[PDB]
Amino acid sequence: SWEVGCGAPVPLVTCDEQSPYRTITGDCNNRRSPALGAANRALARWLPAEYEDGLAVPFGWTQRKTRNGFRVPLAREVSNKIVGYLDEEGVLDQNRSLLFMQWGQIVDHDLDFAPETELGSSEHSKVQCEEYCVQGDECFPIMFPKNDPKLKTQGKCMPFFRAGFVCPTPPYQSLARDQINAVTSFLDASLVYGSEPSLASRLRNLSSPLGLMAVNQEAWDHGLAYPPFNNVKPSPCEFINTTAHVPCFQAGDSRASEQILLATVHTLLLREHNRLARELKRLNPHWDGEMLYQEARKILGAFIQIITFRDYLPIVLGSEMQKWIPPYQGYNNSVDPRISNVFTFAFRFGHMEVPSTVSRLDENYQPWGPEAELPLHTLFFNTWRIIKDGGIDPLVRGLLAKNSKLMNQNKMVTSELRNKLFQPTHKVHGFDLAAINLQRCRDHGMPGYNSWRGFCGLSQPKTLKGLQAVLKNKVLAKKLLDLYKTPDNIDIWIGGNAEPMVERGRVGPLLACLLGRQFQQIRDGDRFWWENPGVFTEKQRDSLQKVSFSRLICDNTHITKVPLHAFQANNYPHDFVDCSAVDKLDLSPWASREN
Numbered sequence: 001s002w003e004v005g006c007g008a009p010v011p012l013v014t015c016d017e018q019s020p021y022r023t024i025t026g027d028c029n030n031r032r033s034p035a036l037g038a039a040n041r042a043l044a045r046w047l048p049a050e051y052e053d054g055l056a057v058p059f060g061w062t063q064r065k066t067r068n069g070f071r072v073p074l075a076r077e078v079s080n081k082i083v084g085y086l087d088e089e090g091v092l093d094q095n096r097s098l099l100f101m102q103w104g105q106i107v108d109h110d111l112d113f114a115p116e117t118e119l120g121s122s123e124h125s126k127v128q129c130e131e132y133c134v135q136g137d138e139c140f141p142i143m144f145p146k147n148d149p150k151l152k153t154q155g156k157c158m159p160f161f162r163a164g165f166v167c168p169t170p171p172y173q174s175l176a177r178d179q180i181n182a183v184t185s186f187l188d189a190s191l192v193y194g195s196e197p198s199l200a201s202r203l204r205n206l207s208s209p210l211g212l213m214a215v216n217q218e219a220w221d222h223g224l225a226y227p228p229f230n231n232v233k234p235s236p237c238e239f240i241n242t243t244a245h246v247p248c249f250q251a252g253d254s255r256a257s258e259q260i261l262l263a264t265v266h267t268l269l270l271r272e273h274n275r276l277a278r279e280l281k282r283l284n285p286h287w288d289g290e291m292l293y294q295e296a297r298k299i300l301g302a303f304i305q306i307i308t309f310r311d312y313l314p315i316v317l318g319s320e321m322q323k324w325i326p327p328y329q330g331y332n333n334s335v336d337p338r339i340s341n342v343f344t345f346a347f348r349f350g351h352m353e354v355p356s357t358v359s360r361l362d363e364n365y366q367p368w369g370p371e372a373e374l375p376l377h378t379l380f381f382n383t384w385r386i387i388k389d390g391g392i393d394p395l396v397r398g399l400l401a402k403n404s405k406l407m408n409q410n411k412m413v414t415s416e417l418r419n420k421l422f423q424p425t426h427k428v429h430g431f432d433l434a435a436i437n438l439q440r441c442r443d444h445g446m447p448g449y450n451s452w453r454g455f456c457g458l459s460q461p462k463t464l465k466g467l468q469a470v471l472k473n474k475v476l477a478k479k480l481l482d483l484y485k486t487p488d489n490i491d492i493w494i495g496g497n498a499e500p501m502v503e504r505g506r507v508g509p510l511l512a513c514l515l516g517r518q519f520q521q522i523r524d525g526d527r528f529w530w531e532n533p534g535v536f537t538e539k540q541r542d543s544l545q546k547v548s549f550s551r552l553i554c555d556n557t558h559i560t561k562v563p564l565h566a567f568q569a570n571n572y573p574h575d576f577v578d579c580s581a582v583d584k585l586d587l588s589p590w591a592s593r594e595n
């Protein structure tokens with residue numbers, strides 16, 4: 001191999017060795033190997049990278065060069081021919097709330113982020129990629145095929161910059177390109193507390209010794225908090241309505257404002273922290289701020305794991321859950337906690353669960369005003385609809401009352417995502433998330449579909465008839481091969497999502513496998529898992545088993561009617577109960593009795 005230790009912005013420090021608290025960076029989780037699982041290191045590889053030049057050039061870069069003998073089809077074309085649909089009727093998941101979608105994006109943002117290459121602060125490279133669609137260094141444009149309506153209207157391509165890689169970020173050359181993960185691999189609520197020490201400090205309110213998180217001083221939501229505005233300008237959130245001039249929210253993660261519902265749950269998590277921090281002061285008045293913040297931070301993270309593994313994963317993986325995530329047996333120092341590259345694509349199954357509209361409901365769960373129901377596209381980087389149009393209560397009710405989009409082989413990704421995506425850097429509402437994913441798959445050097453089928457010990461179709469049988473769909477199998485020419489070349493993202501769903505889950509055989517393995521590893525390899533003996537006490541754990549998202553809603557909003565089981569489609573009011581019927585989190589076990 002080569003250089004068993006490359007790396008940059010890898011910061012400060014080494015282990016307090018006996019501290020009861022996680023680092024912010026993720027360091028010191030594992031003792032023998034302290035960097036394992038930290039932020040700003042390469043995504044792990046379960047299989048060797050597959051580039052056009054075996055080193056870094058993505059398949060589809062140089063156009064005389066084929067992959068296994070054939071030209072790779074354009075990203076946008078695979079989007080246009082296989083991913084899109086018009087009829088939004090009957091596309092909803094009859095047994096999964098919109099919260100099911102939303103929680104996936106959170107967990108996801110807790111685990112991974114491969115940021116786009118920068119080297120662009122007063123640059124025209126950003127422009128050479130935007131204005132001329134010139135493929136070059138880090139610019140790897142998504143061209144439009146002939147007859148694409150976007151030609152007549154936007155340009156010749158959609159800009160697109162490659163993701164960042166390890167040793168440097170400028171050119172480089174020596175070995176195989178590995179993409180960076182800028183967040184910690186552990187399910188540790190980093191999307192709330194940050195993954196950098198610098199950032200994590202800024203988010204805190206270090207004026208009062210109460211272990212609180214910095215909150216907004218310009219706007220309030222019925223006496224309830226809002227995360228602070230981010231003051232970098234230009235601001236994406238400002239651009240979408242210059243008259244309101246409302247900036248994006250500032251949070252542990254940089255994506256918090258990407259879409260209105262993600263910002264919403266970001267606020268719930270911010271509010272639960274401060275809530276905990278002051279409930280913990282009540283009980284332990286001697287405690288100093290640092291201890292409040294840290295104990296609060298520990299409880300909250302405990303919260304995100306419990307919800308994720310008890311309530312979310314079982315209805316995603318389904319009958320495939322037990323196969324991959326057997327019951328807990330304690331921490332295993334030999335297990336690699338790092339998020340694999342391919343995961344960052346397998347976990348994108350969620351993109352096909354995002355419905356076309358977002359609704360605001362009143363106190364009786366009725367349409368909130370004349371413009372209650374909004375197009376998803378008008379909500380990307382939209383924070384003014386929250387601050388200036390209702391607060392989060394109308395949105396939380398939407399989450400609870402409305403359905404997610406069911407994945408459908410004939411209706412994959414909604415046009416609001418496939419045709420009208422807003423990107424922070426740019427100005428237009430016309431990017432394609434489906435096309436970007438596909439392009440990105442090649443950017444990261446993903447192996448194909450069959451290499452992954454194999455990895456997981458499933459069959460590897462080689463023929464139109466073979467794919468037919470796997471996909472249980474003739475027309476899909478036919479469209480897929482007309483474009484890819486062989487099942488070997490199909491991109492992991494679309495290839496994985498095209499499979500029929502497993503019994504009682506929301507993904508198929510190949511996806512269940514990739515997702516399962518990863519989640520089994522972050523749990524078995526995390527020294528601070530909430531169930532691991534020593535982290536919490538008998539008594540503390542016992543109380544933690546009682547948490548639920550419904551409760552999270554009750555303590556932190558003015559919604560008084562909620563479902564018991566928030567992840568499944570619930571109807572109002574039959575399925576809704578009073579918050580007073582919902583198990584609370586008993587923090588008595590956190591009291592420290594003296595002398």
Ligand code: HEM
Pocket residue numbers: 101102103104105108112113114115258259343344345347348349350351353354433436437440
């Ligand atoms: C708008 C977007 C969403 C909803 C309205 C949305 C939703 C999800 C869900 C529900 C996911 C999982 C259950 C999920 C996973 C991942 N996404 Fe993501 N998403 C919206 C928009 C975007 C955009 C834009 C990107 C950037 C893609 C790129 O490569 O440039 C994006 C990415 C991802 C992603 C990769 C994260 C990473 O490792 O960098 C997921 C794992 N989503 N989305």
Ligand SMILES: *[C@@H]1O[C@H](CO)[C@@H](O[C@@H]2O[C@H](CO)[C@@H](O[C@@H]3O[C@H](CO)[C@@H](O)[C@H](O)[C@@H]3O)[C@H](O)[C@H]2NC(C)=O)[C@H](O)[C@H]1NC(C)=O
Pocket residue numbers: 240241242243244384388
């Ligand atoms: C940009 O953002 C502003 C919000 O700052 C949006 O303006 C809002 O527009 C509506 C009407 O178009 C105003 O509401 C009106 O009055 C009452 C509500 O009290 C209602 O009953 C009426 O039917 C009507 O809807 C609202 O007050 C106004 N907000 C302000 C203070 O300007 C605007 O629509 C956004 N424009 C863009 C570019 O999206």
Ligand SMILES: *[C@@H]1O[C@H](CO)[C@@H](O[C@@H]2O[C@H](CO)[C@@H](O[C@H]3O[C@H](CO)[C@@H](O)[C@H](O)[C@@H]3O)[C@H](O)[C@H]2NC(C)=O)[C@H](O)[C@H]1NC(C)=O
Pocket residue numbers: 095311314315565568569
């Ligand atoms: C909508 O999704 C619901 C959420 O998963 C689902 O509820 C699930 O119902 C089954 C009932 O069979 C439960 O699974 C267990 O049931 C019994 C225990 O009574 C066991 O003997 C079984 O082996 C199995 O372990 C789940 O507990 C329950 N899921 C959750 C998370 O609550 C509904 O059935 C779905 N509704 C429709 C219409 O399909």
Ligand SMILES: *[C@@H]1O[C@H](CO)[C@@H](O[C@@H]2O[C@H](CO)[C@@H](O[C@H]3O[C@H](CO)[C@@H](O)[C@H](O)[C@@H]3O)[C@H](O)[C@H]2NC(C)=O)[C@H](O)[C@H]1NC(C)=O
Pocket residue numbers: 205207208212213214215216217
């Ligand atoms: C850091 O922590 C500070 C201490 O909690 C916090 O200051 C407090 O801010 C609240 C809310 O803005 C104020 O409480 C309320 O005051 C009257 C009620 O008497 C209301 O009319 C207000 O609207 C408000 O809800 C307190 O006045 C204030 N506490 C003190 C003693 O100054 C800071 O806001 C926190 N800083 C950040 C950036 O989050």
Ligand SMILES: *[C@@H]1O[C@H](CO)[C@@H](O[C@@H]2O[C@H](CO)[C@@H](O)[C@H](O)[C@H]2NC(C)=O)[C@H](O)[C@H]1NC(C)=O
Pocket residue numbers: 332334335
């Ligand atoms: C911790 O997990 C590891 C990793 O799976 C397990 O290690 C296995 O150990 C056996 C010998 O006992 C070897 O044959 C395999 O190489 C390992 N499994 C694989 C495929 O990685 C181990 O079971 C766990 N250790 C403890 C103490 O629970």
Ligand SMILES: [C-]#N
Pocket residue numbers: 105108109255258
């Ligand atoms: C994710 N966006």
Ligand SMILES: [Ca+2]
Pocket residue numbers: 110111183184185186187188189190191
């Ligand atoms: Ca994390």
